[PDB]
Amino acid sequence: AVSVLTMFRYAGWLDRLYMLVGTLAAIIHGVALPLMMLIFGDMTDSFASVGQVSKQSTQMSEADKRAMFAKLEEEMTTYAYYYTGIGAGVLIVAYIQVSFWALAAGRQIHKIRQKFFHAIMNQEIGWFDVHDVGELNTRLTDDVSKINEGIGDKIGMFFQAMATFFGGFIIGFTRGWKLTLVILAISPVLGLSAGIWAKILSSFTDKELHAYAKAGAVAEEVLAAIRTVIAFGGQKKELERYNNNLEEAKRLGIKKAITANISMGAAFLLIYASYALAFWYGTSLVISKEYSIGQVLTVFFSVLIGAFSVGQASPNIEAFANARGAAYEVFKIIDNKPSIDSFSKSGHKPDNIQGNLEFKNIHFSYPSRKEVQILKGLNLKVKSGQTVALVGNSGGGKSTTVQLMQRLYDPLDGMVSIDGQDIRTINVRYLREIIGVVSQEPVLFATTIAENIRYGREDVTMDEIEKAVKEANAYDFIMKLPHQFDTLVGERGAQLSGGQKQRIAIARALVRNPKILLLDEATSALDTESEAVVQAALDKAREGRTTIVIAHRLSTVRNADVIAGFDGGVIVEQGNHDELMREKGPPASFWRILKLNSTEWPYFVVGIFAAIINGGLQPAFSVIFSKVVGVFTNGGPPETQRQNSNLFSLLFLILGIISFITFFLQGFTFGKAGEILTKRLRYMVFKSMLRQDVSWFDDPKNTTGALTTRLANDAAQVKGATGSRLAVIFQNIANLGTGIIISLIYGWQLTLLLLAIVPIIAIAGVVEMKMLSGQALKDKKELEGSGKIATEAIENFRTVVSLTREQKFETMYAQSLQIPYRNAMKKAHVFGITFSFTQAMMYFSYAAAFRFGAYLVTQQLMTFENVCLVFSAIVFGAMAVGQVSSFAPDYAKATVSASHIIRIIEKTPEIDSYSTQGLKPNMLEGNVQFSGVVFNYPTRPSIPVLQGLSLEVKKGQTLALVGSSGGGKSTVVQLLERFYDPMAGSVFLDGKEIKQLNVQWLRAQLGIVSQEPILFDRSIAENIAYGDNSRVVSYEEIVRAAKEANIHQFIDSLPDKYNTRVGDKGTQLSGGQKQRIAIARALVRQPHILLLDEATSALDTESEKVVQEALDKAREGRTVIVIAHRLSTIQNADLIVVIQNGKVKEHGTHQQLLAQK
Ligand SMILES: C[C@@H]1NC(=O)c2csc(n2)[C@H](CS)NC(=O)c2csc(n2)[C@H](C)NC(=O)c2csc1n2
């Protein structure tokens, strides 16, 4: 499903030369760095030769060694010269490698995007039909961006890394006859351990995902019908399943975190064991006497650099593989032969045609389906100078005759002749330009009408084309109405009426001045005043040239002299219209409250201290590392060098073991702490959402899926925002600080030199990342114009086809893409120069460090063991800082954002709810009054619904309120349970207001029933028992409830009876009975008042007979307010008190017939 070796089809010879020089530049750099490393080994060998104790007399002999110290200084100067030469080479090669590879891509992308646009806009409409409009643009944008990035930088970097690893292993050929054997034999152990630990971690991650899946599902189902939840107030009764699922998820996550931490610790342990074994073997080899320690050190460093190179090569090859599929796809759009070309050489065209089309054997339909036939063959012919009208259900499905006229589609065996000759011989562009169309929707360009008229056809003169706009509504519509100055109209402001749009479309058609005109729904569903005027323009266009018309209303049929229309493919004559029947017509977190949220500092605190000792591993490492060189620096060869080397190897191994156990304890504490925090946050936040009022969920910004994702993925962000980060802070700062202090104790000059130079490279890297990001964002912003052109063109693709003026679109797209293309070349050189500059700064820092170290050694003030000590300590500490900060769990980024979102939603103060302050009366005489209360949706106060309503209810009355809009009326019911809060009026229940009430107690005494009976993923009984939340639990009273609701037969029919469970809609219950079980749930609460809006969800109308039976039984049992926009429901209601918007009272049907039907 991908392609390779052929994605560079459009590459030019200069482009291939650019690539050839670039890749060569990469091998050069990749070879150069291990050359630096080998010269470091020769550097350590020179120091070893100088620091030979030899005879005890020699120490103070030769003028205290002053002469050969001068020789050493000369050698050091030569080595520094070679160092800076290599640095300049690294800078010279880097500029060319990054710039050329990117430059070539810049040109490659410039060619490929233009070719893609040309092909896609040259494609036939049927291809677009089986596709969409937005996803074409999205595919274009993301695929070209990926290809650009990949073939711009990633391939060059990959060749660089591959060459680095190679050159390291060319050194490794010899230096590794003994060393590579052992080092590259212990490396596969590291690889296998990493692989098995990654597999175990992935298995644990999948297990915890499947464990949390149940919690996610229950969250989704409770949030979907949360209105029912707040109607029953089951939040307290809720969350136990959520709590248990989170408990299981937390327990599995503890194991997951333990596994990840032990995997990482094993990684450290294998690294350190490899170090120890390699140095043990190297010390033995150098002690053999035929070898120098510098060669061991340089081969070991070179193979480490090769490992670094292999590790760095992975993202680049991944990006290349990702871009391969996008390249294959984008090329697959290319090279597809369309049905028509419009640019073919075979374009013979007759001159001054009369348009006497003849039609025969028209068998064609939508190409998307080959089962339904729309055109069944029409033996129709037309004549010049006579307007023809088509009448029927539509234009043969949907104006498909028009699609036939200009070759939008390709009829099968459909023979159509414009004047007696086949359309195949005629040029596509000529055929399109000699034919004019009228769109059913006059949608236009987001720009001034002048260029729209220019788009219509070649403007001979602006005044001439303006004269052509002499159709009815001329001048007042073109100038008096659009700001008088010709103005950009379109989606971006300057809206005009549909009459203006149709009129300008007619004007464009007249500018085309075709021999044959096409009219498709000129005033389809337009204003009655908008029509009856543009039809005059249509008529005055029709006397000029022959045309076909399809009319929205039969009036044009009267206007048309010839009426040849039908439906179903049965051709009818056009002699007269008499046969035609009488058709009717958010700030960041303080980071301290977040930490304080973890009130579990004991199981926390040790980890910090544990982390601290971990920070001591890195510099202490270098210490023993330096001492290894200290073995073979100035000292006595035979007394203890073997024993000293063995002792320091044992120190390496015990250091690795203590690091392993340290990181084990670190994991065992931070994982547990983070897991307990994850559980605590989820437990609190879920209660927070169930606590929030209905309005909070109504806001369209937050949706059920959005809140579920908030519960799902806004925890791992905290896992790393709270406990792992402080561990990173403490370990990193302890490492760097102890390295600096040991440097200061063991060094006085070069220590500060390194401490000063490393920050400038760090800030250079940071600023060049910042500049790359800024340039990328600037480019994405300034391609917005080209994106706008592409979107506007593709959205109006049918209009583009209907209008021959199409190459102009390619022209503006090319210009608005080449300006960013020029910006791309300008960015390429800058990117290359900065990357080369930072590499040169790194190499220069290295060279200066070595020069100063050697110079101060010539002063005889710090021994090589100390110079190498401080240098390796600081550099490896900085490397550890970098690796740990990247191995760190994404602190900030999307984590602190989700953290403050979690804090906001938890601390959200909603309208008072679940508040115990609400007064609760012992008994309710159902004294509900609804007089003088006005309110609407808080999210959209645009419509002040519920205006001037007066209503009052006593015990036993059946209030059959029936407003014209059921959904609008639903709000009146929604107010009784305070889903929304009234402000204009007050509602009094039992003679006292409802706002000063125990929300739950009010809800408790309210048997609401929703029109849509959504129930949970629980059993038939577990759902009916949900009504008695915070109440007496129903034990076998459910039998009485079902008997009262008369659904006993269906509960009895179920195999497990009450136990039968509605599991993920398995054994799905009948549509006409879910409302019944909801009614049973409502009557379980046994309230003094019930609310019903059942209406009729489905069309079964049989269980519907049973549902009003249950409703009348309930209403004779207890007082009820029933809402139903159904004639049968209101007629069945004995107490007909139908009132709409407060206009009438009591029985409307007796007062007036308006209520009836
Ligand atoms: C897994 C990841 N490492 C690599 O991807 C990697 C590729 S090559 C390489 N390491 C070389 C030879 S394997 N290593 C050293 O030169 C070295 C000297 S000290 C030191 N590492 C300290 C102990 N390491 C970390 O703190 C640490 C945290 S994460 C991490 N390393």
Residue numbers in the entry: 32 to 616, 689 to 1260
Paper lines:
P-glycoprotein (Pgp, also known as MDR-1 and ABCB1) is a prominent member of the human ATP-binding cassette (ABC) efflux transporters that removes a large variety of chemically unrelated hydrophobic compounds from cells. For Pgp and ABC transporters in general, ATP binding, hydrolysis, and subsequent release of the cleaved products (inorganic phosphate and ADP) fuel large-scale conformational changes that ultimately result in translocation of substrates across the membrane bilayer. In conjunction with molecular dynamics simulations, our structures trace the substrate passage across the membrane and identify conformational changes in transmembrane helix 1 (TM1) as regulators of substrate transport.
L335C in transmembrane helix 6 (TM6) and V978C in TM12 are situated at symmetric positions on opposing TMD halves, while L971C is located two helical turns above V978. Based on the appearance of the yellow DNPT byproduct, Pgp335 and Pgp978 reacted with AAC-DNPT within minutes, while Pgp971 and Pgp302 did not. Only after adding Mg2+ ATP to fuel substrate translocation, Pgp971 reacted with AAC-DNPT, but Pgp302 did not (data not shown). In IF conformations, TM1 is a long, straight helix.
